């Protein structure tokens, strides 16, 4: 039960972030392989806070690494961090961004469009939107009015081409879902939903998770 994210850095390097759920919190293992571009060691500035959890030689010195832990019962969130070598210089993704990883939600798959159930039991969501550049998933439990849970999708991890997608360990305690596109908080009905709720006129309907 883990998910790997291999970020390509902007100084010809790689950063592997493995997120593993706990049997309740989460463990995020960051690993910098290679050498040269990180000559002198580096520190994991998580959101640039006074912390930073310096990476220590984990594998033969070739693989530097650090490990972070996050409390249980926390809703899906995003760990965003930078790396700073032992000279003050910063290290960013090849898109000039801070390495951001999801915690609580897996990457997902672009197909099938709609909501799918995988062999393990994880629920996959996929929606096509070319116009939108920001998509989020709302999960509503039994009455709800406002989302019981909101999961923003990272445009780089939770997107293949123009298909936003995200996987969830389970949807227990949730009965319906909707999509928010562009940034407008109005829930939307999944076009490929096979089961839907009752219409409510502004207009509102939610695809059932059953």
């Amino acid at each position: 039960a883990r998910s790997c994210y291999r970020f390509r850095t902007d100084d010809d390097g790689v950063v592997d972030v493995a997120v593993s759920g706990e049997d309740g919190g989460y463990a995020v293992s960051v690993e910098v392989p290679g050498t040269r571009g990180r000559e002198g060691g580096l520190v994991l500035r998580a959101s640039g806070s006074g912390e930073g959890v310096p990476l220590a030689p984990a594998a033969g010195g070739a693989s530097l690494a650090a490990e972070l832990s996050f409390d249980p019962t926390r809703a899906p969130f995003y760990l965003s961090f930078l790396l700073t070598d032992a000279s003050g210089a910063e290290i960013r993704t090849h898109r000039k961004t801070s390495f951001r990883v999801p915690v609580g939600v897996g990457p997902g798959s672009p197909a099938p469009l709609g909501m799918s159930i995988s062999g393990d039991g994880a629920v996959n969501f996929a929606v096509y939107s070319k116009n939108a550049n920001a998509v989020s998933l709302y999960l509503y439990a039994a009455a709800g009015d406002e989302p019981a849970l909101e999961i923003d999708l990272d445009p780089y991890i939770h997107r293949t081409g123009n298909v936003w997608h995200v996987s969830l360990a389970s949807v227990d305690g949730y009965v319906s879902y909707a999509f928010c596109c562009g940034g407008i908080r109005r829930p939307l009905l999944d076009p490929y939903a096979k089961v839907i709720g009752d219409f409510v006129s502004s207009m509102r309907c939610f695809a059932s998770l059953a």
Binding site: S109, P110, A111, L113, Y128, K130, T160, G161, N162, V163
Partner: protein, 382 residues
Amino acid sequence: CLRYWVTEMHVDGFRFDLASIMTRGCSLWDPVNVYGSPTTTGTPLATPPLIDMISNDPILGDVKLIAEAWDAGGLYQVGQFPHWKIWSEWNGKYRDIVRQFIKGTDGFAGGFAECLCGSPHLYQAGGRKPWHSINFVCAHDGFTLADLVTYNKKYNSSNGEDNRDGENHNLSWNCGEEGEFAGLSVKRLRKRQMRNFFVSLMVSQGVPMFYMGDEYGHTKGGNNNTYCHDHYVNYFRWDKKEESSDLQRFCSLMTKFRKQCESLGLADFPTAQRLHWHGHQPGKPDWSETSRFVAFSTKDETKGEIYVAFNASHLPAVVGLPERPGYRWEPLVDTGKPAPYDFLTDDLPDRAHAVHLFSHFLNSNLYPMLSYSSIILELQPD
């Protein structure tokens, strides 16, 4: 199939062979099949359904979609391939124009300048950007880069089909004598020409594409169609790469220089504000049919300013450089210089001495260029 290769095998893009065949309609629309009685099979379409499905696919729409816009049936659609402002193309017109200009042919200065700018006359009108043009001088089919400057005609007798294979209009020049056994002057000219082709490829707007082996001078013996040879004529020669490591070094440095320059991989077509065209004297380009010299200067957000010049004429020329008060032009690239001085880097301990030996030309804003050669200079404060 394309979605499977993108989602399951994590492929980033596709190049479509004879993509124009994907524009030809099918017989289902013949008025006999539809309506029962009286457009026909094989007729090129304005909005082919397959290309429409690929361009606007949720997944495939955001991958690279390069097209070889022609086929063996006589259809040629360079600049016109139904694109939806998404598809790129193998710019064969760039290949032809660059091959013809760099070899010393009349009437290609304006076309060459258009090629250097991402072919706006082909892609700008339709709504596409300079990087939708895939610029290339050599590919798997046709002459290699080294054969492009060694042979005037194809040698395909080994293919078995009585030398009937491959392009007959190669637009190539043996740089004097033909074959690999030539005089020293011809060999030096060939080295110059290889570097000139690479410089033109690496300073143009668009995507530079080159075939494997062109970085060290791979030769197929004049055979421009080696589709049926499982021997070393089609292999990467790692032992021959070390012999010609000078050309490989020059190509690597040219690629790095393109990466560093902010004004070479442009997202839009060059504008007159950034790009200025010169001739043997600044501000006076020669666009006539007799011209064989093309020079320009480009403002650069990292390099300050870069001056590039191509002298495809058979005559040397002392070209004057733009006058920038308080500034000097510092040599970077000269394909005529012997290696490693064909490209100056800080890894040469005597770079400063090399620059000083030409400072007397660079101080009066001049540069002496050999025939068939290109130069790149950077504007440093002084």
